[PDB]
Design a protein around this ligand. Structure first.
Ligand SMILES: [Ca+2]
Ligand SMILES: [Ca+2]
Ligand SMILES: [Ca+2]
Ligand SMILES: [Ca+2]
Ligand SMILES: [Ca+2]
Ligand SMILES: [Ca+2]
Ligand SMILES: [Ca+2]
Ligand SMILES: [Ca+2]
Ligand SMILES: [Ca+2]
Ligand SMILES: [Zn+2]
Ligand SMILES: [Zn+2]
Ligand SMILES: [Zn+2]
Ligand SMILES: [Zn+2]
Ligand SMILES: [Zn+2]
Ligand SMILES: [Zn+2]
Ligand SMILES: [Zn+2]
Ligand SMILES: [Zn+2]
Ligand SMILES: [Zn+2]
Lengths: 399, 418, 388
């Protein structure tokens, strides 16, 4: 079930799949090629199944981080956009769609955390983390908090940790150094120290999660929160005058949040590789192409410099892009699973007073390596099953 | 019992040991040294145990791949042949007897897969893989197949995969790079793709094993087969006019099959190191030395350029050598166990449609590292084996955490002649 | 209970804590900071618990090898002694208090195995291992052995193995190369070969442990033994005229024993970092500071060149230092656990003739690599239990 003489596209239901098939019907009208967009349940899990048997869609739209596993399984074809078309998108977006120095997907939309604040309580958002403590008691006098965001998630607290020098793995020359962790450098240390300090001073709770944080802002109890474009819909409903802006700066350095980029990948088994490249290069990745998908459903910031500038008219979108530019592309490697979990524990321990800043991060940097075990002994499952899946000759002869 | 004033030699039962005894008799008459040659059953298993206790033979003749484990266990003495004697053998053979850039055995005989074809059906064997498809339907018109060989074994299908750039591990400056696998490069990809294509087109069965392939050729149903010098005896009995030649070429590159080289190693515990070096350097590794072993039992191609040229008179032997020269020396490292098994699965999966070439190969690559870690599991078991051996042979809180239960590593078959 | 404006010190109950307290009293008098010295049970285990929670002492005195784990856990603050003060101590001691090229403790006292011999039986100790065999039968004629020391421990047999080129891991640039083991080089090979030969010739038992060796010397049955400064007290009681001297030499190279160095580390959580650095730099690490600790309890050889020269008056101490200088600082890395155990087995197997020198030494190097990551994974599995 490849396709052959047609195109089949998989994207997530929560996206502008309607907006896409419009560019499908716009393509179909020019080439005579039937484009079918479809959105199956947990496709990001179906794809490793079906593509492994040569079946599945011709292209797949998903976050760039998941493609790492696909590319390593050889499930994605290597794209060949000329230099001219490369200059049409933001250079940083191309670093998000590259596995082993080989380009393996077209960047679509950019997603990053930003600083959301209530314009009523706060006419001017602080440009620095260091003025939050001073700001908090100014607000606490009126029975309001300065800032509240999710602390149970590293994804949310990483921007501050990594603001001074912290980094997952090292990106140098289109390659991630799995042996060059940076959750233990002086940068991370100071980052987390500041965050712990706020909790020790009573400027923040140690048990602030997502729901608590969101609710606090939406009721107008807090002055600021940190969240992405997905939380915008909820605030509009709260009817609370809010603006999204660039994140504050720590020790004069800007915050470095993670960057989730939607990408279009081409099946390595798809016989219509030329057509996919046709569809995506000249039909979708154009002003009207993105416009159309965007109309059914907003995509936040986009990779395409031309259409981005038009969307930038929205202060919120412009801030998401600016935050992403200064941020860090989320590594698509498998060792990333490890990092997440190691850092998660490190922050929670440092928050609860179960460990100290210096100490909990130094346990994490070691703990990350300790998840080399994951790979080894998860392969111990896939290997022992296969040695015994090839000894199926016990059931071949009985039938 | 090491020896001391004598030379005890071990060699496999199927080899020319009686021919060796002659070279042991001609050595005895010229120095006065009694030379015993014995062929113990499963000696590749006996040697690990006895040489570890300082006992066993002074020298051992076995395939070069097995010596890797021996050398790493410090079981083999480092040889010192001068540059003059080195030039007497083929330079490529010396790369087969080297562990950690130290020479640890003398090369004897070379073994490699070749292209066997029936001269009756096929007067001229194809010089290229790309003409096999065209050839097959030319033969299928007469109710005959063009080619049939073992597909269940990577050993047999590797020559085509590695023909374009595929390689196990990287050999650069007398060192194998365990972190430089090449079963995933563009070379391998195309190699396997072509092989899969033949099976998808109906030019080959997905379940062709060794017995099926051999039988098909020996009955004269197939035009060609790929096999080594060990299968020659069987074809002579079939009485079917056959010639062995260089393997075909893929994308203009020649096939790169594995090369099994018989070698003479010297026990690190043998006090008669000087005598062994004497025996092998000036007595065995000579025209008349090899001749003698060869007479009791053919050794195929030999390392010695002088005697090789005389044996080359046989078209079959000359082809084995030529195939070996263009081939790849089989790495004697432990990570090789892993490779084999990873590639075996990859080919079989690609052969059925259960995975694609791109998919199965990139899989097997990840899986190769996956084993060079359960290699630890063995020492981890042998860490606890000797720990509980000595802690028997005499006369709370976070303790629960400990969980060293899984897993098991199930062994393989032997394989598999006659 | 961090502290703040006070100084709490931890040191081993067996060491001269009272001497340290004197130094505390002197600090208090000259500043206004009360210094408390306490020696709790199994403190080197307590510390990892309490320091992980930000609690515990401001400084900790323990062997330098244990600090490796502490430093890696980020439990120790990085010290900043100027170059002037660095020149006051022996340069080799500074290589013992360094984790990842960052200095993390002040060296205090140096400990190393030496050659102890009975002056009555042996007026002059042999300067070379190669003359031991000849010496042994000279002594066996009078019903006495030439040498007896612990063979069950690599710690004791390593000086001879490593004397020709053997080495745990490679120290180059202030960094340990975990991939550059040296228990398999020609140096180690010959080392162990000689040791095995002595046992095969009947110059030594394969089952000589610590107790047996010590007793043999103390009764005056053996002419020589190899042991550290901790065994001195026992010999004095034996009342047997003994002298401690530099270890013999193998193939012209000197023996390379391990060097255990007592160090003062500062808690990374201590708010009185400045005061600790004050206490240790200008109060304890001085002639009168060490003197005082030394009086309650001897510390053997000291890092401080000035006070060392004054203690050198004791032939025994001078020999410990000289043995340490030619020896090998014991690596404080985690892969060290592996080495120990790998070598232990290697020696014992080579002792029994269960393996050859070549074979057993090859096994242990490949063994050290196996149990080294699997002590890293036996913790990875272990932590997933504690975190679910
Ligand atoms: Ca173009
Ligand atoms: Ca950057
Ligand atoms: Ca010569
Ligand atoms: Ca080659
Ligand atoms: Ca003062
Ligand atoms: Ca100074
Ligand atoms: Ca004085
Ligand atoms: Ca000196
Ligand atoms: Ca030295
Ligand atoms: Zn859906
Ligand atoms: Zn404050
Ligand atoms: Zn428009
Ligand atoms: Zn036999
Ligand atoms: Zn065809
Ligand atoms: Zn002849
Ligand atoms: Zn006590
Ligand atoms: Zn004398
Ligand atoms: Zn003797």
């Amino acid at each position: 079930k490849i396709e052959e003489g047609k195109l089949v596209i998989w994207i997530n239901g929560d996206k502008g799949y309607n907006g896409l098939a419009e560019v499908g019907k716009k393509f179909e009208k020019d080439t005579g090629i039937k484009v079918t967009v479809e959105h199956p349940d947990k496709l990001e899990e179906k794809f490793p199944q079906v593509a492994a048997t040569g079946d599945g869609p011709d292209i797949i739209f998903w976050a760039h981080d998941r493609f790492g596993g696909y590319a390593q399984s050889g499930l994605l074809a290597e794209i060949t956009p000329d230099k001219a078309f490369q200059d049409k998108l933001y250079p940083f977006t191309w670093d998000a769609v590259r596995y082993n120095g080989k380009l393996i997907a077209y960047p679509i939309a950019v997603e990053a955390l930003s600083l959301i604040y209530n314009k009523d309580l706060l006419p001017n958002p602080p440009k620095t983390w260091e003025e939050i403590p001073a700001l908090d008691k100014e607000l606490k006098a009126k029975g309001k908090s300065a800032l509240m965001f999710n602390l149970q998630e590293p994804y949310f607290t990483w921007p501050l940790i990594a603001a001074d020098g912290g980094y997952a793995f090292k990106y140098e020359n289109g390659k991630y150094d799995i042996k060059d962790v940076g959750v233990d450098n002086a940068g991370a240390k100071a980052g987390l120290t500041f965050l712990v300090d706020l909790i020790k001073n009573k400027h923040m709770n140690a048990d602030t999660d997502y729901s608590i944080a969101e609710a606090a802002f939406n009721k107008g109890e807090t002055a600021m929160t940190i969240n992405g474009p997905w939380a915008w819909s909820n605030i509009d409903t709260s009817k609370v005058n809010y603006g999204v802006t660039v994140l504050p700066t720590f020790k004069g350095q800007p915050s470095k949040p993670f960057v989730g980029v939607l990408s279009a990948g081409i099946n390595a088994a798809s016989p219509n590789k030329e057509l996919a490249k046709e569809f995506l290069e000249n039909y979708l990745l154009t002003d009207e192409g993105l416009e159309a998908v965007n109309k059914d459903k907003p995509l936040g910031a986009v990779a395409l410099k031309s259409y981005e500038e038009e969307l930038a008219k929205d202060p919120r979108i412009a801030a998401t892009m600016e935050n992403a530019q200064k941020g860090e592309i989320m590594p698509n490697i498998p060792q990333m699973s490890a990092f997440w979990y190691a850092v998660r524990t490190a922050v929670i321990n440092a928050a609860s007073g179960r460990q100290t800043v210096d100490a909990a991060l130094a346990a994490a940097q070691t703990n990350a390596a300790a998840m080399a075990t994951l790979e080894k002994l998860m392969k111990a499952f896939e290997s022992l099953k296969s040695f015994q899946q090839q000894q199926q000759q016990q059931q071949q002869q009985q039938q």
